[PDB]
Enzyme design. Structure first.
Site, PDB file in Angstrom:
ATOM      1  N   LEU A  51     -11.130  29.883 -10.153  1.00  0.00           N
ATOM      2  CA  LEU A  51     -10.374  28.741  -9.673  1.00  0.00           C
ATOM      3  C   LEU A  51     -11.215  27.469  -9.753  1.00  0.00           C
ATOM      4  CD1 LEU A  51      -8.502  30.310  -6.582  1.00  0.00           C
ATOM      5  CD2 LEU A  51      -7.692  30.332  -8.962  1.00  0.00           C
ATOM      6  N   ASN A  52     -10.632  26.416 -10.257  1.00  0.00           N
ATOM      7  CA  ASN A  52     -11.330  25.172 -10.516  1.00  0.00           C
ATOM      8  C   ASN A  52     -10.435  23.931 -10.372  1.00  0.00           C
ATOM      9  OD1 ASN A  52     -13.119  23.692 -13.229  1.00  0.00           O
ATOM     10  ND2 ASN A  52     -13.774  23.782 -11.175  1.00  0.00           N
ATOM     11  N   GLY A  92     -14.035  29.008  -7.240  1.00  0.00           N
ATOM     12  CA  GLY A  92     -15.039  28.338  -8.037  1.00  0.00           C
ATOM     13  C   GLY A  92     -16.318  28.091  -7.274  1.00  0.00           C
ATOM     14  N   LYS A 127     -17.766  25.322   1.473  1.00  0.00           N
ATOM     15  CA  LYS A 127     -16.686  24.455   1.845  1.00  0.00           C
ATOM     16  C   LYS A 127     -17.148  23.138   2.461  1.00  0.00           C
ATOM     17  CE  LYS A 127     -14.068  27.816   0.516  1.00  0.00           C
ATOM     18  NZ  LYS A 127     -13.366  28.040  -0.768  1.00  0.00           N
TER      19      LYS A 127
HETATM   20  O1  UPG Z   1      -4.421  23.282  -6.047  1.00  0.00           O
HETATM   21  C1  UPG Z   1      -5.525  23.890  -6.009  1.00  0.00           C
HETATM   22  C2  UPG Z   1      -6.221  24.051  -4.792  1.00  0.00           C
HETATM   23  C3  UPG Z   1      -7.448  24.709  -4.819  1.00  0.00           C
HETATM   24  N1  UPG Z   1      -7.947  25.165  -5.989  1.00  0.00           N
HETATM   25  C4  UPG Z   1      -9.218  25.892  -6.033  1.00  0.00           C
HETATM   26  O2  UPG Z   1      -9.125  27.099  -5.273  1.00  0.00           O
HETATM   27  C5  UPG Z   1     -10.379  27.473  -4.700  1.00  0.00           C
HETATM   28  C6  UPG Z   1     -10.230  27.663  -3.177  1.00  0.00           C
HETATM   29  O3  UPG Z   1      -9.783  26.444  -2.578  1.00  0.00           O
HETATM   30  P1  UPG Z   1     -10.396  25.887  -1.202  1.00  0.00           P
HETATM   31  O4  UPG Z   1      -9.736  24.624  -0.737  1.00  0.00           O
HETATM   32  O5  UPG Z   1     -11.864  25.888  -1.384  1.00  0.00           O
HETATM   33  O6  UPG Z   1     -10.150  27.084  -0.175  1.00  0.00           O
HETATM   34  P2  UPG Z   1      -8.844  27.310   0.690  1.00  0.00           P
HETATM   35  O7  UPG Z   1      -7.548  27.214  -0.096  1.00  0.00           O
HETATM   36  O8  UPG Z   1      -8.936  26.698   2.052  1.00  0.00           O
HETATM   37  O9  UPG Z   1      -9.101  28.832   1.130  1.00  0.00           O
HETATM   38  C7  UPG Z   1      -9.190  29.884   0.165  1.00  0.00           C
HETATM   39  O10 UPG Z   1     -10.550  30.457   0.242  1.00  0.00           O
HETATM   40  C8  UPG Z   1     -10.961  31.017   1.537  1.00  0.00           C
HETATM   41  C9  UPG Z   1     -12.286  31.700   1.330  1.00  0.00           C
HETATM   42  O11 UPG Z   1     -13.294  30.706   0.974  1.00  0.00           O
HETATM   43  C10 UPG Z   1      -9.903  31.992   1.991  1.00  0.00           C
HETATM   44  O12 UPG Z   1     -10.156  32.443   3.314  1.00  0.00           O
HETATM   45  C11 UPG Z   1      -8.495  31.375   1.979  1.00  0.00           C
HETATM   46  O13 UPG Z   1      -7.552  32.367   2.437  1.00  0.00           O
HETATM   47  C12 UPG Z   1      -8.170  30.936   0.554  1.00  0.00           C
HETATM   48  O14 UPG Z   1      -6.846  30.428   0.489  1.00  0.00           O
HETATM   49  C13 UPG Z   1     -11.367  26.361  -5.111  1.00  0.00           C
HETATM   50  O15 UPG Z   1     -12.049  26.898  -6.258  1.00  0.00           O
HETATM   51  C14 UPG Z   1     -10.449  25.183  -5.458  1.00  0.00           C
HETATM   52  O16 UPG Z   1     -11.026  24.323  -6.417  1.00  0.00           O
HETATM   53  C15 UPG Z   1      -7.205  25.007  -7.188  1.00  0.00           C
HETATM   54  O17 UPG Z   1      -7.609  25.466  -8.300  1.00  0.00           O
HETATM   55  N2  UPG Z   1      -6.034  24.368  -7.166  1.00  0.00           N
END
Ligand code: UPG
Length: 483
Positions: free
Chosen positions: A76-77, A215, A375
Site C-alpha cells: 500500500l502506497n 507501506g 504512524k
Molecule cells: O486511500 C488510501 C489510504 C491509505 N493508504 C495506505 O494504506 C496504508 C495504511 O494506511 P494508514 O493511514 O497508515 O493506516 P490506517 O488506515 O489507520 O490503519 C491501517 O493499519 C493499521 C495497522 O498499522 C491497522 O490497525 C488498521 O486496521 C488499518 O486499517 C498506508 O501504506 C497508506 O499509505 C492508501 O494506499 N490509500
C-alpha cells in the site's frame, strides 16, 4: 438508474471523468447507504470480543514451491502521512541508514527473487497523490522496477467525489477542482483490482494468493507457514493480528459480530463466528474508552492480509461486480487547510473490512517482527534507532535484546508531532533505545550526541521557553532528567 437526484449528479460527474464503472457501482451503493443515514458506526453493542486464535509461531508446516509461486505481493502506497506533517508519500521518508521505506521495499523484492521465488510478482498501490514521486524515485534507484512500472507494478487507485454534507451532491471548489476528489481509502484495493482488470489478469496467469501490507510496515513479508495454513484450512481470507500494546492507537481491532447458521436442518443451530474489523473512525466516541481497552479488544490488525484471488474475483462477480465493504463517512472540508471551505463527506473503506465478506475468513496471531508500524514521529524515532535492525532479507525488526517488545516512545505531541520538530529533537543524533523500555519526552528537548537510554527514562522540561539539550554522551537509566 439510481436514483436520488444527488446520486445521479455523482454518476454523471464520475462518468464524465471516465471513472471506471466498478468504482461507480461501488461508490453509489455507499451513497445510497449514506443517504439512508449510514455512518459506518459500529457501536460496542453490535460486537463482541474474540478470544481464541491460532498462533503463527505455533505453526511449523511450510507450503510447497508451487504455492509460493502463485503468490503476489502488494504494498500500500496511496495515503500521505499528514499527521506527521508530510505532503508526499510516506514511503519516501528515510527510515534507517539513509534509506527510505521505498528502498527497503525494493530490496525485499530483489532478495525474494534472488533467493526464493525467481519471478515473484510485486505491486504498489499508488494514488494520484503519490504516483509521480514514487515513479520518479524508482526510475533513478531501481531501474528493474521502473521498467515495467506503468505496465505491471503500479495499481492506481480510484478517485471518488467528495460530496457536500447538506445535499450529497458533488462538491464544487473552483480554486482547485482536484480537491473535489479523493482516493476512497485502502479498501479501494479490491475495487481497483477488479475494475482495472488486474484481478482477472492475475487469476488467468495462475496467481492464487495475494499478500498485502502497509507501506510503512517493513516487518511484513511472505511467510510460507501462513500459506500452508491457508491451504490446509481452506482459508480464503486471512488477517494477521498482533496482541495489542499500549502503543497501538492508530488502527483497527478485530471483533466478532454474532451469527447462528442453518445446516439444512433447523435443529441446532450452532452459529458461525463471523469476524469483523472496527476502525477507530468507526467507533462512536461514546464507546471510545472500550475501543481503547487493550484487554477487551486485545487483537490489533496489522494490515498484513492474505487473499485467495480466485475466490475474491468470484465473490465480486456475483455481488454485482463489487465488494460491499461498510462505508466510512468522514467529515472534512473540501480543502483541508481552509476551515471555511465547503463541508464534505468523504466516503472510504478499509481493506481489513473484507474479513466479513468471506465464508471462509479468519485471523491468526502473529509476533511483532511482522508489525513495525510508522504512524507517528515517535514510531519513526524507534525505527531509526538501534532498537530496530535490518535482516538479511531486508526487513526491519526489533533487535533480539528487545524480546519482541518495542520500546514505548512517548513524545510530547506539541513539539514532536510534525517532522520538523522531530528532526530538531534528534539534530545531534538519535539515541540508543535498544535497552530502553520506555522514554518519555515532555516539553522541549534535544538529544545530545551519543546518548544512551536504558530502562525507564523521563526527560522533562517544564520551562518551555528554552530547549533542554542533553549533554553529549549522557547515559540515562531509570531516571528523570530535568533542567
Ligand atoms: O486511500 C488510501 C489510504 C491509505 N493508504 C495506505 O494504506 C496504508 C495504511 O494506511 P494508514 O493511514 O497508515 O493506516 P490506517 O488506515 O489507520 O490503519 C491501517 O493499519 C493499521 C495497522 O498499522 C491497522 O490497525 C488498521 O486496521 C488499518 O486499517 C498506508 O501504506 C497508506 O499509505 C492508501 O494506499 N490509500
Amino acid at each position: 438508474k439510481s436514483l436520488s437526484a444527488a446520486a445521479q449528479a455523482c454518476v454523471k460527474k464520475m462518468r464524465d471523468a471516465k471513472v471506471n464503472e466498478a468504482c461507480i457501482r461501488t461508490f453509489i451503493a455507499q451513497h445510497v447507504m449514506v443517504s439512508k443515514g449510514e455512518t459506518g458506526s459500529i457501536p460496542d453493542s453490535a460486537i463482541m470480543p474474540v478470544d481464541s486464535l491460532d498462533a503463527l509461531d505455533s505453526l511449523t508446516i511450510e507450503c510447497d514451491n508451487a504455492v509460493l509461486q502463485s503468490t503476489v505481493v502488494l504494498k500500500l502506497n496511496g495515503g500521505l502521512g499528514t499527521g506527521m506533517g508530510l505532503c508526499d508519500a510516506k514511503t519516501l521518508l528515510e527510515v534507517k541508514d539513509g534509506k527510505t521505506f521505498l528502498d527497503f521495499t525494493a530490496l525485499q523484492v530483489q532478495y525474494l527473487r534472488q533467493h526464493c521465488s525467481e519471478h515473484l510478482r510485486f505491486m504498489l498501490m499508488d494514488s494520484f497523490n503519490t504516483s509521480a514521486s514514487t515513479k520518479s524515485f524508482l526510475k533513478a534507484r531501481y531501474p528493474w522496477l521502473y521498467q515495467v512500472f506503468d505496465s505491471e507494478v503500479e495499481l492506481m487507485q480510484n478517485q471518488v467525489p467528495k460530496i457536500l454534507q447538506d445535499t450529497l451532491e458533488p462538491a464544487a471548489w473552483a480554486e482547485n477542482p482536484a480537491y473535489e476528489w479523493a482516493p476512497p481509502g485502502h479498501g479501494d484495493i479490491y475495487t481497483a483490482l477488479y475494475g482495472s482488470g488486474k484481478l482477472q489478469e492475475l487469476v488467468e496467469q495462475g496467481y492464487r494468493y495475494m499478500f498485502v501490507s502497509n507501506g510503512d510496515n517493513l516487518g511484513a513479508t511472505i511467510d510460507k507457514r501462513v500459506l500452508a495454513y491457508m491451504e490446509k484450512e481452506k482459508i480464503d481470507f486471512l488477517m494477521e493480528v498482533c496482541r495489542r500494546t499500549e502503543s497501538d492507537k492508530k488502527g483497527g481491532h478485530l471483533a466478532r459480530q454474532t451469527v447462528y447458521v442453518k445446516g439444512k436442518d433447523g435443529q441446532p443451530d450452532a452459529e458461525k463466528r463471523v469476524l469483523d474489523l472496527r476502525e477507530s473512525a468507526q467507533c462512536p466516541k461514546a464507546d471510545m474508552e472500550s475501543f481503547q481497552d487493550i484487554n477487551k479488544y486485545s487483537f490489533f490488525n496489522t494490515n498484513n492480509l492474505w487473499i485467495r484471488l480466485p475466490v475474491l474475483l468470484e465473490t465480486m462477480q456475483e455481488h454485482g461486480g463489487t465488494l460491499p465493504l461498510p462505508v466510512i463517512r468522514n467529515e472534512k472540508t473540501v480543502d483541508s487547510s481552509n476551515s471555511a471551505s465547503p463541508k464534505v463527506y468523504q466516503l472510504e473503506t478499509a481493506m481489513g473490512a473484507a474479513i466479513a465478506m468471506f465464508e471462509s475468513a479468519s485471523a491468526i496471531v502473529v509476533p511483532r517482527s511482522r508489525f513495525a508500524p510508522v504512524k507517528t514521529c515517535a514510531d519513526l524515532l524507534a525505527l531509526r534507532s538501534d532498537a530496530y535492525v535490518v535482516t538479511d532479507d531486508f526487513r526491519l525488526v526489533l533487535d533480539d535484546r528487545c524480546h519482541g517488545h518495542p520500546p514505548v516512545v512517548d513524545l510530547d505531541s506539541a513539539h514532536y508531532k510534525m517532522m520538523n520538530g522531530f528532526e530538531k529533537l534528534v539534530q545531534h543524533g538519535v539515541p540508543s533505545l535498544v535497552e530502553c523500555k520506555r522514554v518519555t519526552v515532555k516539553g522541549l528537548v534535544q538529544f545530545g550526541a551519543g546518548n544512551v537510554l536504558t530502562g525507564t527514562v523521563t526527560i522533562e522540561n517544564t520551562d518551555s521557553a528554552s530547549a533542554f539539550v542533553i549533554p553529549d554522551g549522557a547515559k540515562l537509566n531509570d531516571t528523570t532528567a530535568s533542567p
